[PDB]
Chain A
Amino acid sequence: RTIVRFNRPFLMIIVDNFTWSIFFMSKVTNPKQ
């Protein structure tokens, strides 16, 4: 009964478990660019 709605700016991060090297990172302010 919980709603998670990505209808506003959001962040994504791809993190290596062992090194915490960050492979990729993004901020989405407008998916329609």
Chain B
Amino acid sequence: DRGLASANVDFAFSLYKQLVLKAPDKNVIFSPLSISTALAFLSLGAHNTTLTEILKGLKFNLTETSEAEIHQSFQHLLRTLNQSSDELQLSMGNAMFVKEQLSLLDRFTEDAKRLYGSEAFATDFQDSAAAKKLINDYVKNGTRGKITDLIKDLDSQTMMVLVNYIFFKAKFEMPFDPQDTHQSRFYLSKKKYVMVPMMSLHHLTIPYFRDEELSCTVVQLNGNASALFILPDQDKMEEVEAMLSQETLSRFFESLEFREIGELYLPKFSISRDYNLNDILLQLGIEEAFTSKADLSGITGARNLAVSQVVHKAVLDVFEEGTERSAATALEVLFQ
């Protein structure tokens, strides 16, 4: 539905601003879909206030889209994120790693596989280093070596870990020539600057829009997913971030017209970030899942599970031939 769109953008931009608030000058890279898919996957086993808090935390309105329509949209979306072309490599997976003896409801394992593509891996969490290596290899495999060490510390009393990964590699329509990549200034601010390899192309026709109102330019440099590059004027990053919303995102899309660009300069670079999202998810109202009042009895048939830690890691590579994105989310669950 259209109400799914309103939820997805609100959740993505809400999370983004919360990530920024923790360290307002640091690089940010993350996958909103990865995080919300792991939580939606968890909500398959939630009930009562634990369930409603999760789905509301994801910005869904339950009166507007039912729980079954949310899971349906995730299912449909996951199937589109496994594709291969000469121009695209997409992959996305879900998995649950479970204490070998822990009994799971048939409905939960069936739903998890049908809707989220998730198998169940018997794992010995008491052998903590081996369990960690098992999960980290699954993510490393899924993201083709790009996300390593997603899980650094794992409680040895862990009952299960729900994992999502996503991998996105895309060639530029018009690649940059590496002969035209040269060290150039990058201005952290008006008076702080470093030298970075700066790629360049001449005479590009690409979707373009100058927004003199918000003091920014947006362009598109590339399937069925758009990639927007939003370039605020100097000292206008904060102003631009202040206006991020569904509304202005839609306005950006409705205003992009093809246009010939004399020169385009874009840095060649790699950034990565990892986060613990407990604080942010509690701040978003997902709170009962973390306490002894958690109700995950849709997983096991008892209220014997609560979330302990949610971690997220993402990596972004920009180079002459295209871009590479990957991310993963792990939801760690303890006994109660």
What residues of chain A have their CB less than 8 Å away from a CB belonging to chain B? 1-33
Contact = CB atoms under 8 A, between A and B. Distances in A.
Interface residues of B, number: 65
A9 to B, nearest CB: 5
Nearest to B234: A8
Contacts of B27: 26-30, 33
Contacts of A2: 208, 259-262
Given A12-B228, A23-B31, A31-B271, 17 more contacts: A3-B263, A4-B264, A5-B231, A6-B266, A6-B267, A7-B185, A8-B237, A10-B229, A14-B168, A17-B226, A18-B224, A19-B4, A19-B77, A22-B9, A22-B12, A25-B32, A32-B269
Interface of B: 4-5, 8-9, 12, 16, 20, 25-33, 73, 77, 81, 166, 168, 184-188, 194, 196, 198, 208, 217, 219, 224-232, 234, 237, 240-241, 246, 249, 259-272, 314, 316, 325, 327
16 contacts: A7-B186, A12-B228, A12-B230, A13-B228, A15-B227, A20-B246, A20-B249, A21-B33, A21-B77, A22-B32, A25-B28, A26-B30, A27-B28, A28-B267, A29-B188, A31-B267
A5 B264 CA distance: 6
B26 A29 contact: yes
B219 A7 contact: no
Contacts of B225: 14-17, 23
A7 B264 CA distance: 11
A28 B268 CA distance: 12
Nearest to A25: B16
Contacts of B32: 21-25
A22 B8 contact: yes
Nearest to B8: A21
Given A15-B249, A17-B225, A26 B28 contact: yes
Contacts of B316: 12, 24, 26
Contact of B261 (A4, A19, A32): A4
Contacts of B265: 4-7
A16 B228 CA distance: 11
Contacts of A26: 27-30, 271, 316
A3 B198 CA distance: 14
Contacts of A27: 16, 20, 27-28, 237, 241
B269 A16 contact: no
A7 B26 contact: no
A16 B219 contact: no
Contact of A31 (B196, B228, B230, B260): B196
Contacts of A14: 168, 225-227, 325
